[PDB]
Amino acid sequence: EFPSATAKARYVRVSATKARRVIDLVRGKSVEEALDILRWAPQAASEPVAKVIASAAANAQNNEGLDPSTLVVATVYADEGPTAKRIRPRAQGRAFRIRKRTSHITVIVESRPP
């Protein structure tokens, strides 16, 4: 087994599959390429994911004293969370519901020697 550190941000106001779109672009890459891709991918979900990756890198560098140049993303995944419930008026006075979705984000980082 190899040393690893984890960091997550729950209750983030993005859709699960919509954040997973961006998340699929970072699996298995090094942290530097990850930061570059998240900076240069024009998506709203790019901000929370990049923040989570940056926080995880900070935790790995501080708590365990690992060298950031050798860290790589081991597994990253988003799971749907509690959904805020709302109501919307529609035509003919008849009413439909709006499901305000919320997602979880999990990032664990692994340090792999070259």
Partner: protein, 54 residues
């Protein structure tokens, strides 16, 4: 028209999996003594000093 039956796991996920994004390449430029990263659209602009990067 409306659907009359639930489209299955395989159909839904197979259709959805094609919708993705593509990661682009980056360009290193030597400006002001620092090497910073732009897309190739901005290589000349970076060397001359006409593009703003935070």
């Amino acid at each position: 028209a409306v659907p009359k039956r639930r489209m299955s796991r395989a159909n839904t996920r197979s259709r959805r999996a094609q919708w993705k994004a593509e990661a682009p390449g980056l360009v290193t430029v030597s400006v002001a003594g620092q090497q910073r990263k732009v897309p190739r659209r901005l290589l000349k602009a970076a060397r001359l000093g006409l593009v703003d990067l935070d």
